[PDB]
Amino acid sequence: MDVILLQRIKNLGKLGDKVSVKAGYGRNFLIPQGKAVAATEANTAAFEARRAELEKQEAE
RNA sequence: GAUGCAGUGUACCCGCGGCUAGACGGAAAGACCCCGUGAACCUUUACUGCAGCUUGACACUGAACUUU
Numbered sequence: 812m813d814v815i816l817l818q819r820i821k822n823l824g825k826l827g828d829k830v831s832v833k834a835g836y837g838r839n840f841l842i843p844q845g846k847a848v849a850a851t852e853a854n855t856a857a858f859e860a861r862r863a864e865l866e867k868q869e870a871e
Numbered sequence: 872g873a874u875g876c877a878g879u880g881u882a883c884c885c886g887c888g889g890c891u892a893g894a895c896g897g898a899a900a901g902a903c904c905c906c907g908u909g910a911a912c913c914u915u916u917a918c919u920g921c922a923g924c925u926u927g928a929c930a931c932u933g934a935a936c937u938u939u
Binding site for chain 2: 821822832833834835836837838839840
């Protein structure tokens with residue numbers, strides 16, 4: 812899947828970068844636990860337009 | 872393989888008790904044998920399928936460190 816990260820991941824990236832992962836990785840680990848969101852156009856717009864400042868605010 | 876054909880012999884008409892030599896006696900469209908481009912079930916290194924079992928590829932299926 813194409814996903815947008817919600818946090819730091821060692822080999823993927825961090826804090827809003829769009830990166831393609833294997834479908835099982837996104838479906839079973841990241842998305843259910845909130846570490847990323849599927850990179851739909853609506854999801855990307857909703858993430859970047861508003862919420863991103865607080866997402867950056869949480870350092871740890 | 873004749874009561875019924877030919878020739879011939881014998882023989883008045885009709886029961887009853889017995890008998891089983893013949894009526895190729897009765898019974899069952901021969902089961903033995905052969906035939907039909909018939910049937911069924913069984914067998915196998917007959918033919919052709921399938922179930923079952925098994926092999927690999929793709930999908931469900933992800934992450935981080937090493938080696939040739």
